[PDB]
Archaeal histone A
Amino acid sequence: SNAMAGNFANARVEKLIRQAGAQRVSADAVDKMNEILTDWGKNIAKYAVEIARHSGRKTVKENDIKLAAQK
Amino acid sequence: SNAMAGNFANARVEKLIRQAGAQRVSADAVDKMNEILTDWGKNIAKYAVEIARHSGRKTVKENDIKLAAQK
Amino acid sequence: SNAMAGNFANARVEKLIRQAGAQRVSADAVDKMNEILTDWGKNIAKYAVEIARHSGRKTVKENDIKLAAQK
Amino acid sequence: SNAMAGNFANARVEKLIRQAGAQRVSADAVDKMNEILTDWGKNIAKYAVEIARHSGRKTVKENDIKLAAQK
Amino acid sequence: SNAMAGNFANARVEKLIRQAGAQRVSADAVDKMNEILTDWGKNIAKYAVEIARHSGRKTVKENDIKLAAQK
Amino acid sequence: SNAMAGNFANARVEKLIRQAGAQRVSADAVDKMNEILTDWGKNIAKYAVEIARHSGRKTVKENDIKLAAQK
Amino acid sequence: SNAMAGNFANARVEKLIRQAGAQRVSADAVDKMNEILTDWGKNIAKYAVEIARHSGRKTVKENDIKLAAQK
Amino acid sequence: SNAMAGNFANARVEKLIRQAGAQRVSADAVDKMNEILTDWGKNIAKYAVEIARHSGRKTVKENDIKLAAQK
Amino acid sequence: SNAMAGNFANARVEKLIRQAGAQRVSADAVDKMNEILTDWGKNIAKYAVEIARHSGRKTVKENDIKLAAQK
Amino acid sequence: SNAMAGNFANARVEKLIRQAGAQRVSADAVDKMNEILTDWGKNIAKYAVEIARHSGRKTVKENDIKLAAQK
Amino acid sequence: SNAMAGNFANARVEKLIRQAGAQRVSADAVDKMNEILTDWGKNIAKYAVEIARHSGRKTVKENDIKLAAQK
Amino acid sequence: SNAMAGNFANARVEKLIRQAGAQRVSADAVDKMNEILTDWGKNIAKYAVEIARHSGRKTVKENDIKLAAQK
DNA sequence: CTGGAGAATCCCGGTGCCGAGGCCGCTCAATTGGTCGTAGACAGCTCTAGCACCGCTTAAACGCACGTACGCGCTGTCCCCCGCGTTTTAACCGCCAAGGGGATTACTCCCTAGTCTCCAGGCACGTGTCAGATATATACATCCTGTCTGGAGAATCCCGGTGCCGAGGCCGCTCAATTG
DNA sequence: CAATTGAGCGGCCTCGGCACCGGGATTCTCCAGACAGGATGTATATATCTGACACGTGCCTGGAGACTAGGGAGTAATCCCCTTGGCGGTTAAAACGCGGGGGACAGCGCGTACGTGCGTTTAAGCGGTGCTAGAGCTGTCTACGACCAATTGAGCGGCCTCGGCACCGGGATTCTCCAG
């Protein structure tokens, strides 16, 4: 569902909320968490791609992701 | 791989980095991004579960996720 | 002085710094500590008010302050 | 009340919670907020006193409070 | 009052300003806030309708509002 | 519905989207627009309350809302 | 020079400034204009890619560029 | 193609849209983006030339481009 | 009234609306016209001051106002 | 001076240019700004009078000025 | 150099970049940092001047700068 | 004064606030603005130094400052 | 077309800023001498644009069903009117503290020579990519009931005056601590 | 070491923080009722892993470019010392926001019905890959044009001072705009 807004599988975002200690989880909470992870992940990935390319490279590497998350 | 450290499918974290504009993506960058999403998602989910339970409820809902992300 | 920036009495912020072990205390240090306590207290109080209201209540209670400080 | 645990006047901690937007405030919430401000203020003041004395001075100044809060 | 300029109920725009922390609220401030919300909401809604129709649809959906607000 | 997340009446947010030119409007789009108006209105109202109080006043006035929207 | 900051050829950005009526053009003005075109073009292209993908397509088309420029 | 309407090389406008994240790019989208960059660049360059000449100079400099873009 | 929002005398803004052909003029229309003239005049004056200073001068002159209005 | 060309008091148009940041202001710049405000204000007022009369009214109101400025 | 674009002394902007940990610093990086500080400082100062004047004062004070930076 | 907290000359921070339009400027406002510029400049410079070193270089360059400010 | 009432009008008073004059000096313009950095002309390596070929991605076509619009239901709300007091604004004194001034300094900006180091080119290894199969964990019903939401009523305890001490803030004198 | 700066100790008197009663509305508790999350079971479209390919990265090498260090002259930042403009208390009295009470209107909801958006396939666009040729963008070197820096003169903007023009403000009146 809403594949542009939530990138990840719903069954995996639900597993994450239930391992955080949830006794029950609403389907709307799984969709909201999926959207919040996707928006935040997209911000880090966009900045890591600019760091890769400033470095002089086509390939995104572990160090570019690590530096972009620290911003 | 490393299912406690990276919760999401690697093929979906790779798709996110390539839609951010990546020309090529290292497997270590996919693993690092998966770990960074998992650690941040776990922090929000743990706090949303405490908001649900303070409210008086067993169920995590959309509003608890929304309030926990705003913290 | 500066009642929007420093909420607390200066004589009480000075007593706190002198019980921390200060041999002498500058008036600018009392004003800076008052401002730092006020800015941090305002952040916790604003979030505790959103927790009260999510809970369904007009009244801020001890548990809302306790949960907001743990954020 | 509890002058070692809450350093500030209760009427001033209550004013802070009501300017954060509180419609009503419990006396236990005023006491809990006073305790949380006091414990956090004491940690900063104790470290600022060690910075003053490392610097070679008896007087706590604005810059020592500012550096201790940034820790 | 002024139903083209302020779309929302005045009692609901006043409630929003008082939950933001207002001790008292002028009727002109309620009218100005209503106008500012209406002008900004109309800009987002007009652009979301063009996104719906570019997509090939008569119906405005959640994703069109979300994409129009991000512009 | 979701009265903390959407402050305004749904029938009034729907009227706004249909006067922007919408042929049809999804209930999720009405809820998303209500949330986006509420989050943006809350940011302006919180800053207008700080301008009122810096000015030396308990009352939020038209000029404080106007200055806060221009920020 | 500075291929991440200025995307276009300098000889083509210089031709544009001289057809605007310039009698002489500084090399720093050619570099500044190249950077300003690149930053603005990147903003439009990033938003057109999100419109393409909301539409359900991998391909950026003329209508997505046209709608993104009108934002 | 259409050298008065699109000033820049098509291969460079295509590279810009693909680094914005495009999976595929239509030739009409490359032509439309080239035209939109050219029309906007011409407006800034024409105004920067009037600023140069008001200043008393034949040469367009970095500061004239910077001031014209801020208009 | 509202001297920051309306800069000009109300009796002079009213004379302007009545010479435009108005049979009667509301006091709120005089206040709205005063605000609209003030906001637009402030935008031109701020840009004319930057043109004066780019030119190398402390004095705003007729040519700086004329160039700023043409922007 | 030139009361048909500049409607406003010169002392008030000068105050506006000096609050925009002017260190010094030429009398010709005050006259040019007065003329530019008068010509633009007359265009809005003439159109607001036609909106009032289309509406069926002799009185120019706040909403007619607001709609005429948005044209 | 470029005194409208970079307000501060270059020797002081260079000292700041070298205390941030720089082993070597390019003269173009000192000029770019000076410009970025100047543009951001000008935005805060312009808004603090509007807060001073809304308050009813000719003098910019510490509290106006503090409130303008928090915007 | 306070050379660790305010890096820039006070006469240059005062000139910036007076060109923003200030009729008068308090010495405490000059000190507060100097501190706010220094804290923000230090954050950008520290991150630009990490970008330089990730790139493989000892020298901070214009592009590293530009990328660090965009974070 | 008709009734009822906000509110723009026309009048009169008085006072506050607009406008005009005269005087003083900072500021903008012109003029000159050297220099930075532009325009012109020339060689060659580069990346642009243009066929030709292959297939991924697209735009229609149409057939189930998700979820919208129209209609009609109650009652939960907002908007309006009145009475009451608090908050704000305007007018007046008195003291910080910004302003404008002159003098001496520190630290800035520019020119220098010496060389560390960032860029460019040509190389060999690492590894991300593209295509193919396997099987697993995802998403979508379906049936059940656990949980959350309401609704109504005790009663807890926070809001709202109250009087009165407590202690926070201010001023002045002093010499200990900090700065240079 | 020397000589300020400004924090400490002191004495008076205000603001405002505290503790005490009363009134009451917000909160919690106890059932009833219906969403909607959970658990089971299926079909399948994903994610994962392989293996063969070659493009991209990292290495080592050389050359020039631009940063570092060192010196000098000039300057603008800083620091008193003085003047006074203006920020801030004090206050007295309208302005208008709060609070309580009524009443219709419009927002929410529940059902019904069919419109339309999503899904599955089809055929043909047309974008991607690949190679070739060449007209561009680039970099150099040359030299002179025009920009910047320093100066001098005068013009016009800034400051102050008058006085009177007109903007602002009631107050009584009736037009006219809003409702129905």
Q: What stands out?
A: Chain A is about 65% helix and 5% strand.
